[PDB]
Amino acid sequence: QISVRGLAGVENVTELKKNFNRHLHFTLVKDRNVATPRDYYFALAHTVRDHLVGRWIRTQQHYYEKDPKRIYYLSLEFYMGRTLQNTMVNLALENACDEATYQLGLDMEELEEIEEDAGLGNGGLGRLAACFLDSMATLGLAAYGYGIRYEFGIFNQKICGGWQMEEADDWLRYGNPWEKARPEFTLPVHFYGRVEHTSQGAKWVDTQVVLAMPYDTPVPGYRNNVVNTMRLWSAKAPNDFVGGYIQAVLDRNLAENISRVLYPNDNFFEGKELRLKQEYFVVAATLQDIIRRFKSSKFNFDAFPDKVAIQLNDTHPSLAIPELMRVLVDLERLDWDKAWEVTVKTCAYTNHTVLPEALERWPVHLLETLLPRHLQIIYEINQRFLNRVAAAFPGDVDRLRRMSLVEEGAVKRINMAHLCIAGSHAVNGVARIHSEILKKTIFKDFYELEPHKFQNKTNGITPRRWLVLCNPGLAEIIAERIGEEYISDLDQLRKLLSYVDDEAFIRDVAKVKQENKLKFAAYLEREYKVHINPNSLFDVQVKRIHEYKRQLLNCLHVITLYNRIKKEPNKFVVPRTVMIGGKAAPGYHMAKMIIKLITAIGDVVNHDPVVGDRLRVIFLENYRVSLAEKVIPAADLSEQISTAGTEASGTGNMKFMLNGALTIGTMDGANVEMAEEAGEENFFIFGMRVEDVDRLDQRGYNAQEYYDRIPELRQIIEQLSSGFFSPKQPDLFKDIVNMLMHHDRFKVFADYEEYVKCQERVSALYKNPREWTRMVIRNIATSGKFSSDRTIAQYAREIWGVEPSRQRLPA
Amino acid sequence: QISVRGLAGVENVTELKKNFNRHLHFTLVKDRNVATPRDYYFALAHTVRDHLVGRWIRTQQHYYEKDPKRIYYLSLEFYMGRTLQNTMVNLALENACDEATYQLGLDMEELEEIEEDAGLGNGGLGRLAACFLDSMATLGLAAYGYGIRYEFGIFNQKICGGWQMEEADDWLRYGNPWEKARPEFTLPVHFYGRVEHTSQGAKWVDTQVVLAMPYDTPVPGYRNNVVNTMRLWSAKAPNDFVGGYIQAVLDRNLAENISRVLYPNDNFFEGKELRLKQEYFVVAATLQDIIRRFKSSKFNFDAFPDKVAIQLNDTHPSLAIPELMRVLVDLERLDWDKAWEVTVKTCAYTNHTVLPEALERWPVHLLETLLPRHLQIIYEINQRFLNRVAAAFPGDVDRLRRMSLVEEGAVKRINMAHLCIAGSHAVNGVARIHSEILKKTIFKDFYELEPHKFQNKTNGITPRRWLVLCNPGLAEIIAERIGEEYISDLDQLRKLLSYVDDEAFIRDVAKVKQENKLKFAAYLEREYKVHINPNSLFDVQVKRIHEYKRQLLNCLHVITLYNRIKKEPNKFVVPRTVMIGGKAAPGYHMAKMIIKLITAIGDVVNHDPVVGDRLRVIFLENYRVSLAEKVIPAADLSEQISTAGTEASGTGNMKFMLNGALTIGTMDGANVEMAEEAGEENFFIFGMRVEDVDRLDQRGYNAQEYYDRIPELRQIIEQLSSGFFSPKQPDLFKDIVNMLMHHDRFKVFADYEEYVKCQERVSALYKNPREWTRMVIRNIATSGKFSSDRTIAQYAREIWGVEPSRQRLPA
Ligand SMILES: OC[C@@H]1O[C@@H](OC2=Cc3c(O)cc(O)cc3O[C@H]2c2ccc(O)cc2)[C@@H](O)[C@H](O)[C@H]1O
Ligand SMILES: OC[C@@H]1O[C@@H](OC2=Cc3c(O)cc(O)cc3O[C@H]2c2ccc(O)cc2)[C@@H](O)[C@H](O)[C@H]1O
């Protein structure tokens, strides 16, 4: 039906129907007469997975015999989403499976809606991991994702009475047809115990054992026949063990609780023991796998960093550094100095945030108890690292205190970021502005000691999931003009600037948007019986709910729009559907209040007969990867409105740009590079830059000043306090008011005026559909930099020391 | 290679090799080069399971369209063992799979050793369930096994320092290739809450929900193309739910603990709340399934007992009676009287023991809390039942007290046996002597009220698992003489009496035994490096360790044999390997002491150079279904030595008889019917009959009398007390001595003298191998009565009201 979806060859189609029917019979043990849509989805999934298998075995045996340098991407999050569509796209089977299912009397897109998200992440860091796996496979890297097979991913969000309610994300209830259990490669992980020092140095003894059972999931490259592996570990009680026999069997649960659930904190450090156990579990099992694979290869650990790269996604797997030192010194019996040389050449660290509340600072007592040998190693790392600091900066005692892996205080803690910098040959931020901030502020001391350590790798997104999968309409009109090479060479989208005056392309770009908006409107109607005006500007802020992301600033604008209509009812305004969605971490009270305020605004705005269909505010329930794939192709305006200096990069920004939305944003994270790529005349940039936030911090942020000088702001704060948006609970939003007036770390009121005025420019442009569409073409055409293929090629060349390849494997 | 194993057709073999290789590639995702024997086992299992699938779908759709009466066998235990061999035998694929694997360079029997027992039972009651499923499928009954999918079956037994140690039976670690998850047919089960009485009668409200997820396993009949279903329920926390979000997700474990582990009590009632929850879980989910299947059939609950039989394996699923009454009255709104008429015509009860410690007597407070509506219904059942008792036996107030479902005392309890008799149209014992005892003693009052209720169904064993699978050598020499109809018509073994003087058959029977003994000796050598003299009489007592089963009496004989050798070293005796095995329930101290005494006797006997290879005592570790299949075909002498009146039936007795062992036993359980079938001249019967035990109970059992009058007994008791068998812990066996001398409920010393003398007759016959073998032929030839096909045909005709059929399904 669509070119970019590939060929429905008569042979391909007849085989797929045959294999579909074989799986329905032998795999599902179902007759055509009793089979539910869920059975049909599973029959298709098994059929599509069969097509991976030959390439999956051949890829791995190609890496065995050719023995390239292996890349290990360690993350406590893989935010993978659904696998069925992505697999069909990367194997060129989408049109064949669509034809095959149609001939069988089935709608493939209804079947796709049955699959559970693999929601094994919180947000950007998690989704980055997932985009990276896709790009490493597409660039033919010998790459392995290593993580935890959480039984429960990020909670399912319900909205009840306008409030977030959390349900368990039981994603494995009907099984996972993609993964292969590898219980034969199960490994032991140790906890607690103590250290004895003997003639053969240190031994870690009297430990409790937890087994790590790996589950392998295929990662297909784009039409290159490469299939890499994501290995996720599952916690299992060891074989051998007052409540007696029954209670001892039930107590197996405690060890298995290690892989039970994803900690739902986005950009926030909660120092829970169980979280620490998850971090060590993934590091200990993974490094045993890496060492085993290293020893059984073509030929001493001198060559270890020429055969191994360990990339640490944030500080979460930071214990890989002391764990690698433990295995090399305590088990392989290397000298400390050689072990340390190997470790630093093997490991690199990615930082994702500058917010102090996000930094991992584990109490020393917890490490003493859980991981006694790791604490000893961390102390020895610290002594030798501070010895090098004293030699470079003699007598700079405060530098010694600031740089230490040990933080003094009521509770002594280990700074895991300091451990990562000390134990890694490369440290990177995730956008140029963030990487510079790292060198200027939080890691200034480390930058001065080792300037060549510090790099930038600007984030990207995979144009497979984030254009070809989610927006086939837009992929199609682009391919019709420039062919298909752009799908793994996204800089070719620059060829689109040649069509900025082409009436046909202009018509087609607006037509695809219109279709995406009618499809999203229909989804909202089907699933939730929510009606939206599809002739409205779709104004979309989707991301985790946080003070720094300033959903509240969006809230102040929505009420401004409502209050201007009530003041001048007869005055024409561009109709808007304002859509906000995202999950609040369960214990983040302010975030849960903000969700309640969005729904409360909706309760007034959406029922005012003076407003009617000119303005709608809706909270999108259960924002996750599959919902991103539906709403982002439907968006006209992308809200990227973080306080300047607070969003390290963002990736949602890059998805919206790729899918034909215009961006309203601050000069923050990758927004700066996106505005540089398209031209700032093609971006709605507003608000304080980093330097203006710093100047305001220097003289003190007084929010009362803004309230006193802006009548429209005062009216809104007064509506919040007096109970206009909570008439039966008039003091409901006291906490939001009090934070905005007195405790606002993110300076919401300081950007209010520039934001409202910038929003006026957005509406002005929207009234001119031709010029709106021409500005959209200028955005899409310059989004190529933001491909994760670009990001990964930089990692491969500048940190891992390996060369990418688009060249195909032979079958 | 062997006729009874079927045809290795060139086409059959080439297909199996093709499907083996397909599963290795697509199912296991493995190359020939990396594949372990475990992978090869799984490739074969998946290949063999594929052959079930067509027959499995067709059988179930045949029952849908033909709508016969359905039989529901409710058991908290299915002791199934391994499935791979049984499946190949029942589909006639054993020789083809053997040839197919041989051509692939693989030993099918090594592959079979990789499969985990489905050890979802304790002993006889559990194994009876399993034999019954096999026979119902072989007799073309529309039968369903309903139970619990325990994550952990009966514990793995290790012997450490001569002591039992329990390990968790992690039978699902590598998956179960036989079962099909049916998460789509998940049902809710309710716990706790309270009852409100409204205008529409009673409602059960404010309950906690646990979901029951069914797993369906195929049950193949013998070469009749019938494939029935065993449905096992798995506990799952409901969708919707101070430790906050993380703790609430971890707390899902508590509801899922319901299907975590099999209670390892054989013939003993432990009143644990979690056990009660398991009983209600299996009853509530099962009866919802039954009611749904009843409503969606060819046509009011009047016809319900013409379409449904519920068979209660012991009192474990006794709550089916009040549960069926709850659904019919509270949900379907039937009058009490009609509901009760339906319930009694639907339900029947099997009793497995007369021992008071085994009877389920649940505290009323526990039922009040867990199952408030069920307690109300049980009270109303009791009132109406005792009203019928008062009318039949006016003024017999003590009869009213003895028959009540309610037992008065410090703790008021419900007698679940009384509930079963009241709520069932049929009650059966499991051997003629046991069924008569029921009518004469524990259920005398009930027999007088309703004599036509009380039946006998003598236990049986499936000659598929217990002859063709385990002893193909013996199956073969029998088929060579009488053909193969005996395999599902076991009374044809009577034709073997024609060969009692045939020199060839006599030679062949002794040759098969000799081969079985060399194969068992080799297994013991391979797995445990234990050496046994294969030219010794194999004297075997395998069953759960209990005082009533009198492993201790076997112990007194072994030491008698040792003490006679030491007294007269030069005197020739028939060499013996004395083998004892079985599990002790973890909390049964006396049972664990007995295991320790068997190993302690071994520690002396097996190292005395005067004894050498003339006598060996060994404890067989981890007695289970797969180990029964190895040792029972190797046995010369079957020990069945329970105190007369205590073993309801036994089934181990019947296995040994089928496999060419002679029996030494009491006139207890089915031993009486086995001696009647073969002729008592062909059995080594000894000891008190029931009437002699009763006479001893009447004047008081004084064990000191026996000790005072039997010098050989006194010597042994003195060896036990003085520390001869525990030299470093001389008082180790004080508890055994004290129980034997003062508290022995099973009168061990009273049968000592007759047992030793009967054992002398066994040895005398063994010295004459021709006459031993002729007596064996007379045993095998008369074992036909003991087929579970015979037992099931009786259930079908005399309780369920359905006609068996050996006729085949068409494909
Ligand atoms: O940001 C400031 C913090 O926010 C809230 O607590 C949490 C912070 C948080 C966040 O800022 C972003 C997230 O994605 C997640 C967060 O989780 C918690 C939290 C607090 C209590 C818990 O039960 C668990 C975590 C506040 O409740 C807390 O007082 C404050 O320290
Ligand atoms: O037979 C007499 C009983 O035996 C032991 O307890 C148990 C009995 C028992 C049995 O006779 C056969 C079995 O298969 C299992 C049995 O389990 C326990 C038992 C006691 C304590 C526990 O922790 C659990 C069960 C004795 O420890 C107990 O004192 C006594 O009442």
Swiss-Prot record, chains A, B:
This protein's record includes keyword Nucleotide-binding: yes
GO cellular component, one term: skeletal muscle myofibril
E.C. designation(s): 2.4.1.1
Record InterPro entries: Glycg_phsphrylas, Glyco_trans_35, Pyridoxal_P_attach_site
Named cofactor requirement(s): pyridoxal 5'-phosphate
SUPFAM superfamilies xref list: UDP-Glycosyltransferase/glycogen phosphorylase
Name the record gives this protein: Glycogen phosphorylase, muscle form
